[PDB]
Structure 1
């Protein structure tokens, strides 16, 4: 019993360590996804601006 339960605690420690590794990964995933949001929103602005530039061309044909 005591020995089996010590090994269960060794095994739960390694699980907690695996979860720490996963949280780390998830932070990095979030970082990049946040960045992507910010870049896509920048693109949106630039494409919008291009709409207006296009229309102006049309209207001065």
Structure 2
């Protein structure tokens, strides 16, 4: 029926929006991981200087 189709269509829409937000979280994680690489390397350099 139309009511069943709309309910599934809305539930799928809610899921698809949650997945786009997760995709963004992943990108942000990739970013933080890179910044940490950099700060860890900085720390490594400084420990090595003494």
* Moved >2 Å (runs of 4+): none
Stretches of structure 2 that go unaligned for 5 or more consecutive residues are none
Greater Cα radius of gyration, structure 1 or 2: 1
RMSD between aligned alpha carbons?
1.3
Q: Deviations over 1:1-55 (max 9, x none)?
A: 232022101110110001111111221122112100111012112211xxxxxxx
Per the normalisation by structure 2, the TM-score is 0.74
- Matched length: 48
Stretches of structure 1 that go unaligned for 5 or more consecutive residues are 49-61
Per the normalisation by structure 1, the TM-score is 0.64
